[PDB]
């Protein structure tokens, strides 16, 4: 059935012809200035970031060389001429700088700077440019563009492009060293000659720039990026203010993790956990680098099941795709992630020693995260990593009180759980009489863990009555599977079952078969009364049997909400109270 | 106050120059071949869509015969990746001109218009091999004159070479040495589930190794009456990857606002609750791209097409994302209206569906801002009523178009079941109105009508809570009972002194009502609906009793014969009566005071 027509065939006739690649100009602005990001409000983050270069630049030129104005970027909008204008006061550009940096598309005088540094100088993790295309996305939203600039050198320029394959070039007067950019927006895009639009736009991407930013006059970027300094100098109030701002919320982070690493990558990063349990009526950890925001929600940098982490990430060797949004498939992601799952499980593990009453809250609000951890990951080594945070009860431990999977296990032991809705269901099962595992998801959890510490976990799954009981059973029809006699005290009867799958399957149900099991104290003055009041009262009998059923089902934990029977609860109480 | 450095203080001295823009080539290069694709493999793609160009170029001049397909191999021994496409291949001045210049694009050019089945356009993707390759060899035979067969040849360099060749193929066979980096793309699973991913409803036959693979009509883009309902069930299966069939099928096209293709199918299979907690493909020219959807109709399975999203260069990002929210609102709309029309078409398929996917509903609800798009979506609710039979399914619209001239509300009640609802105390008391009532069962509606708060201007209003809002206003209620039934103004007066003492810290107000008939008593809450939900993280609670009641009655009687069993009495009852209210905690505390209650009074039988 095979067909292939590709065969070895070809041979070279004759020989020569070398030739060069080149480059259709016009076509490839027209992409440069269109086609590269998702939005074309990127354009104000693109000529920031260049201003931001710009001011770099001549801060790191002034340590040696030193001269003497202050280091700011200016933005000014004009809703009735439709401009928009940036200003720095950078570094700016003579006229041969200005023709071979702006005129040549993915030419970067940027990383030329930055290849040309001392890897150690400050400059050289906080330069944004490399592509050399960045400048062009001002076409996006601009007919006309015009820069001035001076040199910081011994004449000032002017630069200006329609962005049609041609610019020029003339010498200005009145230029104030750095570089002036002045867009004429076009028609649809004059949204950007409006000041609430630009603030929206710088506070998105450029909020944390180096250097000041003014808009109309006006100082705005007042946040500084935490997680790019040192952890124990940082207070509890900033962490407050911080995680808000960049988790868009309104309560605290109840955790707190600023992880710094200069070792398998550069990580600049914070982490937090929310205050508030997430529920029914719901941004996540944001990437960014070099202070220049990428994706507020980065897909790539954390496994799916740490998403309830809010917080930000920052690596300044991270490599970037061209559009800035995207990261390009590398093994130092897939490193990087790796690596802050073991750093966030470690944290964790951490506070469950810390203060494991504050810890066990946490596992109350998010332990489903965990338990969709597990489900999820290949990796066997990590599912066992992840479930060094689960908690449980215990078959020997008491109630309301719980224990990791790493406590011992106690000789010979080498395999342990009964996962079911509550306590009192548990200690009366069938399969128990040889873990207490009570939350939802639990059995799937471990059904999927398989196996930790190498070890093993499995599904550890006088006659005066008669007459009342063979009665009950005639009540009862088709309610419960089976009754039976018991020797418990308080308790009139109780309610048991056997199969701990029929018990949830059931609790999702909003009769019923679950064959459970209805045990019974003739010790009880109830059951007493019960047996004589079935010849001497039959309706009377009927209510109180239905009631000590409800009762037992309510305190087995099978019937939450008793709303169902007060109506009938009522009626037995007026038929027993007849007599007072 | 203001620290502003710009002027307009510019001015240019003297003439200027005129200048050309320019370009590093093998910058660009490097950035193509290194940052361009945030994925290695979409090379595949980029060279089969290449591939299908020079088809359908050679199809639209062979309306002046020969076969047209495309044909992957992948040598693992020697490290190489190759396709070979029948098309109109190209010569040498092609060759230079197209592959040599980035940027440069013949699938453009050749755009003399009527076609829609072109895919290039950037002029850029060919050199996605250098992502996966340090040598390209191409062969092409123009198929035109009496041309010539060539190899163009690169290593990546910014330089390639050119000959003529001998044995060259109609059309263009293009060999990629790959790196030992990238050595996946010789493996014939791997380079399948590429074609797969972006390639499977390319137009022309494509055969990897000689084997043809399962590519697919891309049915969106066709004639919604010409589609069966066994083709609709294939696809769905594909694109949600499911082994289940649609329960329902909107296939929607529109040139309106905006140009839409999609086909979305709501699984038969109800949502695995796991998964809930824990949707739709987005294509152009039937090669697939990476929300469109609002959130609360990710339950929807399926694809859109829209030709007036923009692509970028890398074809994997949408470029206006007000077009976006522009199409996520219609489409948003029209699958409320098809949800609708369904509701209509077939009222107990619909019951299922509701029954099913009702919580995306009503989380849609909650978390809408806009109170327009909250009506909209709640158009979709069904409930129960009082005016209907038992079992029968309403409207919000239904009980809108039910309601007088004059009633400016629309009263709602939420119990587990219709016959709790039915004899609910609380329904009992709306039962002296003559207003309809909606009977709410699931779990989360009330928490949906607070967040809903009205529709069509018309407030929605709980019974418990129009109940507590009756009494700042004229009771005006008379009892069921004649006052022969009912305790004597003086005796009740007594029963509420007493009352008061033995529930001190647990109730704001105790009071009679004339509002029961069935119920001995009810607590009351204005904002019910809102305490019922705080409760799933004391009150203000009011107890009103029915002195017409036998129980209470008895009650008064006991406090005076037998007061501890009194105190017994009045505690279960207010404890029944928080219980109808939907506002007890764990109920098995009380299990046992009710035990020693039950023992007690049947002490004397
Ligand atoms: N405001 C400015 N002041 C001084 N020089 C500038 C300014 N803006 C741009 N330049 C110079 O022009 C070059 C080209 O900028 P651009 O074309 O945006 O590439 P890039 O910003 O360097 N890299 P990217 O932003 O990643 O595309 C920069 O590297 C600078 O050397
Ligand atoms: N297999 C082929 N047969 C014939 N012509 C081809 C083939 N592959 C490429 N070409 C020609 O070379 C040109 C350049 O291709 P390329 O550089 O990939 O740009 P593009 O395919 O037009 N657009 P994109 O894929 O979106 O970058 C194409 O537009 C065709 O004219
Ligand atoms: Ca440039
Ligand atoms: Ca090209």
Redesign the interface.
């Known amino acids: 059935?095979?067909?292939?027509?590709?065969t070895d065939?070809?041979?070279?006739?004759?020989?020569?012809?070398?030739?060069?690649?080149?480059?259709?100009?016009?076509?490839?602005?027209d992409?440069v200035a269109?086609?590269?990001?998702?939005?074309?409000e990127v354009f104000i983050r693109e000529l920031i970031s260049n201003g931001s270069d710009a001011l770099e630049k001549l801060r790191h030129r002034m340590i040696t060389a030193g001269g003497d104005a202050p280091m700011?970027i200016?933005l000014?909008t004009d809703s009735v001429k439709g401009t928009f204008?940036i200003?720095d006061?950078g570094v700016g550009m003579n006229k041969e700088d200005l023709?071979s940096n702006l005129?040549?598309?993915?030419?970067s005088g940027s990383k030329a700077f930055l290849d040309a540094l001392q890897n150690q100088a400050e400059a050289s993790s906080s330069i944004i440019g490399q592509?050399?295309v960045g400048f062009y996305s001002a076409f996006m939203v601009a007919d006309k563009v015009e820069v001035?600039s001076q040199s910081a050198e011994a004449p000032?320029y002017?630069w200006?492009?329609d962005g049609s394959?041609?610019?020029?070039?003339?010498?200005?007067?009145?230029?104030?060293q750095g570089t002036?950019i002045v867009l004429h927006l076009k028609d649809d895009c004059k949204e950007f000659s409006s000041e609430d639009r630009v603030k929206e736009v710088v506070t998105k991407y450029s909020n944390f720039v180096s250097f000041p930013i003014?808009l109309?006059?006006?100082?705005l970027n007042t946040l500084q990026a935490l997680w790019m300094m040192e952890p124990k100098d940082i207070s509890e109030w900033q962490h407050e203010e911080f995680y808000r701002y960049v988790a868009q919320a309104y309560d605290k982070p109840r955790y707190t993790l600023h992880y710094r690493a200069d070792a398998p990558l550069n990580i600049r990063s914070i982490f937090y956990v929310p205050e508030m349990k997430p529920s029914?009526?719901?941004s996540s950890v944001a990437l960014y680098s070099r202070k220049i925001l990428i994706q507020t929600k980065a897909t790539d940098i954390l496994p799916?099941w740490l998403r309830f982490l809010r917080g930000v990430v920052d690596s300044e060797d991270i490599?970037?795709?061209?559009?800035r949004?995207?990261?390009?498939?590398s093994a130092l992601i897939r490193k990087l992630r790796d690596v802050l799952q073991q750093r966030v499980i470690r944290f964790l593990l951490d506070q469950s020693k810390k203060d494991p009453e504050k810890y066990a809250r946490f596992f109350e609000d998010y332990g489903?995260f965990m338990r969709?951890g597990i489900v999820t990951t290949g990796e066997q080594s990590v599912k066992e990593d992840i479930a060094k945070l689960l908690r449980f009860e215990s078959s020997a431990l008491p109630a309301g009180q719980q224990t990791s999977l790493m406590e011992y296990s106690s000789a010979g032991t080498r395999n342990y759980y009964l996962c079911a809705p509550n306590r009192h269901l548990a200690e009366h099962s069938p399969y128990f009489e040889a873990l207490f595992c009570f939350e939802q998801?639990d059995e799937?959890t471990l059904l999927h863990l398989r196996e930790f510490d190498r070890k093993k976990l499995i599904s550890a799954e006088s006659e005066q009555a008669e007459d009342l009981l063979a009665w009950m059973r005639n009540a009862l029809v088709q309610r419960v599977t089976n009754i039976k006699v018991t020797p418990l005290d308080?308790?009139?009867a109780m309610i048991t079952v056997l199969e701990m799958g029929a018990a949830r399957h059931f609790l999702?149900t909003?009769a019923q078969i679950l064959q459970p099991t209805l045990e019974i104290n003739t010790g009880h003055?109830?059951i007493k009364?019960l047996h004589?009041?079935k010849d001497?009262?039959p309706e009377?009998a009927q209510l109180?049997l239905e009631?000590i059923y409800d009762?037992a089902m309510?305190?087995a934990?099978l019937?939450?909400?008793?709303?169902?029977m007060?109506?009938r609860?009522?009626q037995?109480?007026?038929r027993?109270?007849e007599?007072?």
Do not use: C, W
């Open positions: 059935t095979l067909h292939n027509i590709i065939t070809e041979n070279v006739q004759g020989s020569f012809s070398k030739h060069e690649f080149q480059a259709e100009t016009k076509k490839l602005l992409i269109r086609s590269l990001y998702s939005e074309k700011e200016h000014q204008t200003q006061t023709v005129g040549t598309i993915a030419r592509f050399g001035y000032g002017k200006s492009s394959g041609v610019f020029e070039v003339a010498e200005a007067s009145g230029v104030r002036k003014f109309n006059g006006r100082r029914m009526f719901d799916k490599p970037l795709n061209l559009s949004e995207l990261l390009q498939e489903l969709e998801f799937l308080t308790h009139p999702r909003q003055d109830l009364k004589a009041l001497s009262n009377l109180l009631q009762n309510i305190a934990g019937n939450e909400d008793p709303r169902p007060i109506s609860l009522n037995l109480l007026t027993a109270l007599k007072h």
